[PDB]
Subunit: 355 residues, 4 copies
């Protein structure tokens, strides 16, 4: 028997349709109890389970999966979520860590990749699956992707010891800090462009155990509430003026992810480079990520002006890069040099180092 | 209000797991009645519907969809289906044509492409959707593709006027006579290699109305029970001996689909070509299809020996080609030349003619 | 019989290690010496060998100076390229522009708008590896762009790479290392090259022979792109949208949702009141913006970009804002139209 | 310093000429290549006084200098006319010149290239050096073609890397030969390796899957199997295929057959058909079951209760690999039937993934 906590933060999955427009949809648990795929009534009465606890029907193999639904209030559109909301989620997981074997987090798709990346860093030494999921269509609308996404997340978290923050959608389990949202309409909404899925679901369940990170049983969970808030993302576009870059990098900003062209090239006009130099002199740390969905940043852009304050993001998604930068800048009592060293390491499986 | 007939012929979808092995699973209707996504009990009692009739919950838009389940006996593995089984299905649709607005046929995946292709030809002047569907995993197993495939086929047939035999799987609606099975394990089991899907299902339903065939309201449905049975498929492999080809093409064979290499090239060894000439002289009709999943046969192979008795299949799937040949050969009172002309036409949207 | 192209070389990896013409002259696939002497052609003019069908293709190489890394290109560079095409418009049947891949999608999008009523192919191309390195993608990309521009009347600014012809204002760069570097996420390619050449004539735009080419040198320079990220502060958005900015492409989440915190929405309202025009594009590679975000505060000054790439959106905004003597409402109407095949209107 | 290749030209579109919109044979490949700088460095040739049968590639980025000799077979063949004997001849050419060259490139028509590569894979036991097949949809003498880059890439791969396998190089990808199949008759991406990653990819960088590439066994000498059983066939089961036709197909002197069945390995179960398989097994015929599906694997079980161990699962093998392996195994001298069945169930050349 394995018990999960299902944390419902918001998003389309739980909403209601009302005159062709989506509104909030509380009482997820009341709906799930009425669905045989989500709740086995017969086993519940036959075990006299409390009625806050749902029980999945028996699967092919594995142990029986039970879960409790924790509904956050207020429920959020994911576009409104911030570092503080993700910290709250991490603190919920922390508080209930010993009582459950895994966690599923229902989350809006819009910023799910950012949430998964943040939680990935916040939950240091994670020993248990934390699976984010969501849907393009609410579970209360008849024709939807939510039923199978939610069930799959529960089954994965319930049956496998994958000690990572993941995203489950459309029969695929991705490493959370490797995903990005690529399609605003299709059920295949997400992509892990520089890493295989951790798992695939079909007639069989296939898991890339070669990739899945190792449980460090000896070390306790450490939850980082200390995440630097003053980090930003800046997309360089052709002809972007130095004065706009200057304004964007003004105090109190501590870190920025620069999204550059192709293999990591920004404009080389002297007034723009000077603004990057000046920000590095103020102590600002810059991480260079590619605007391209796939591939990697080759080192070199602006290094002759910003020195070691500009760090290559290699093949990281911008979501991962922003999370890592927030994490590293939030660590207490480190030199600048130590921060730069940490940014250049693969801390959670988010970055592939050249071989 | 729109009423559908759901015809259950067999296949994995309806089976049961028993000691890691699949066995037949009758009484589909008794399972569906217990699933809210498939049957709205409240609306059924409130309309005093007979209890052979199921009612889908309300969808976003559209009218209400009701359906009746017709379970064939015996239920078949699709590998054991034949032209006669498909004729039976076409006669079921014929018999109940005026009573229903659409049809869904649950079918095994192994020969679903052949079934869809056959029905496509059998149902001349079809005015209503006939949607085949199935699953890699049975609907009675918890983690499956069957729930969403079956629901999607019902919703598509219930809500849209697509007057074609189609295949619905994994959120995609394909033209039936354009599909082939490409994966024996994944939920994306089928491909329409030389035509876009007719429809895609996501947050929105997208329909390629430019491709969908036109309802000819004036003409009545004509069901072709006269389908020539003595048609075969022959895959040419390198070095295939003339004597084996001779044996394969003996009477009483009337037609054969030859699967040749690349753009339609078979071996040119004289003894093999002579066997094709001799069969053509006996009146055998041959259609040349490519072994390649994608692309088209260029005219020319063996034409200097078999003359007009060897016809290019252009970009047809072999399933479509075999169906069309059975159809054309079964038509009454036609010359050989007329049969050849008909094979070269696009009769059901199965074949793209060159510019 | 004979079709002449101008090959404009602006910079990029393709030509790296000047004098592109001297290399091309020595490559039989690019220059037929025998036909050149037999027709006494001037030696600034190259001649492709005969292709399968079609007429003979001749071309002249115009090398820009200085040559640019594409990351350093700006609206002015693209205007210059448009003026080169304008100047030589009657003398050639098509144009090929060698360009760096980094901003090729932005360049193609800009030229698409600048060249109003274009009647002739303008094909951009480039390479991940220089043509002078033995193992490269440049030879076939360049040849394919010449052959397409030389043999087909596709009156659009296009991008040719890795055997595919895309609509220029529909492309974006998706891979920084592979030869398949570009994607047209919301539109099929205009053409594919294989054993046969397949052209989507159903998509290709119609030549309006009556109307003359009009080149828009009047492109608004004070337009920007702003990527909203979770928790982006209102004060930063305020700073970003200060005068003299006239237009901005906001890149929002999913179907077009930005954060709804009141202080941020207020900054968008305030910019709209200053007359700033905003276009909402999705950060997602694929799909479309649904109308509605911030419309109750910014009103008609915030426009849905539907399925546009951000490159197309920024170009269109520069184009529309540069048009003389239009009301604000007219500018908003134009942004909502499909002006160059860059945007699919719902059906 | 220097690596020497033998380029064996057997036929195919690559070397042909266009004449009135129709392709005819094109001899004297070497005379054309000498005039192309990408294929021949004249300056280095004179400066080293190389014999003029030997071509020299220009210097590449890294690596040693690559020289190659062109051996043109006569007569040149369309690949649809090739047989086991032609592939044996190729294997004997490689054998004869094995010590004089460091690698081999074989120009071959695309139509049966997968069969050729699969055959050579088995014939060349303990291969220590790359044998790279390549070809083109369009002749190298037509201006706009895929042949230049395919041929150059094959030469560069064979010249610069020690991949001791029979491979196929097309469209910037190196596939394991016995894993490929032709999927498109018109596009430059003509081939697919459906159940194995490419061994290599070519872009700005060359990426090689060294984890997959087989290990050079330097101690063991090359053994070339001329002893390949010729009486092996491929039979594609189609719905309703009659027992009498299967009986005719499996008559003596056939020794082995690859049966192509539906989905996960299911053929029709009608008793008269199964009886014909039993009867063939009793005559000593060996049968390998492969899936008609491009992707995925045969699950054991079909017809095993009648044909016993004479019917063997082909798992995820392509039909080309299966036919080659069967020919190889049946050609081995003095083996019991049980031994032959064991060998068919092993991964002998990287063609089959065991569960």
């Amino acid at each position: 028997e394995r018990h999960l906590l299902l944390i419902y933060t918001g998003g389309t999955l739980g909403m209601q349709s009302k005159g062709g427009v989506l509104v909030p949809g509380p009482g997820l648990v009341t709906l799930l109890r009425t669905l045989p795929m989500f709740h086995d009534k017969e086993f519940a009465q036959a075990q006299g389970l409390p009625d806050h606890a749902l029980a999945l029907p028996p699967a092919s193999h594995g142990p029986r999966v039970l879960y409790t639904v924790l509904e956050c209030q207020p429920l959020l559109d994911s576009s409104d979520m911030t570092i503080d909301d993700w910290i709250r989620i991490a603190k919920i997981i922390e508080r209930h860590y010993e009582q459950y074997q895994g966690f599923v987090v229902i989350h809006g798709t819009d910023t799910m990749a950012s949430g998964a990346s943040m939680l990935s860093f916040m939950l240091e030494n994670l020993h248990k699956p934390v699976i984010l999921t969501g849907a393009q269509v609410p579970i209360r609308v008849l024709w939807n992707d939510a039923r199978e996404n939610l069930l799959g997340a529960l089954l994965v978290a319930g049956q496998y010891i994958i000690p990572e923050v993941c995203l489950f959608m459309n029969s695929q389990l991705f490493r959370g800090n490797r995903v990005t949202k690529v399609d605003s309409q299709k059920f295949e909404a997400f992509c892990s462009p520089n890493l295989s899925p951790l798992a695939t679901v079909g007639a069989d369940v296939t898991i890339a155990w070669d990739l899945v990170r190792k449980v460090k049983w000896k070390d306790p969970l450490v939850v980082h509430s200390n995440m630097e808030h003053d980090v930003a993302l800046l997309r360089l576009y052709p002809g972007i003026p130095a004065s706009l870059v200057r304004a964007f990098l003004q105090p109190p900003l501590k870190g920025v992810v620069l999204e550059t062209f192709g293999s990591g090239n920004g404009p080389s006009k002297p007034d723009l480079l000077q603004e990057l130099r000046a920000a590095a002199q103020r102590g600002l740390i810059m991480v260079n990520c590619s605007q391209c969905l796939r591939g990697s940043v080759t080192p070199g852009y602006a290094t002759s002006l910003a020195g070691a304050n500009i760090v290559s993001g290699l093949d990281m998604t911008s979501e991962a890069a922003l999370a890592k930068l927030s994490y590293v800048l939030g660590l207490p009592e480190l030199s600048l040099e130590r921060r730069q060293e940490l940014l250049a390491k693969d801390l959670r499986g988010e970055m592939t180092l050249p071989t």
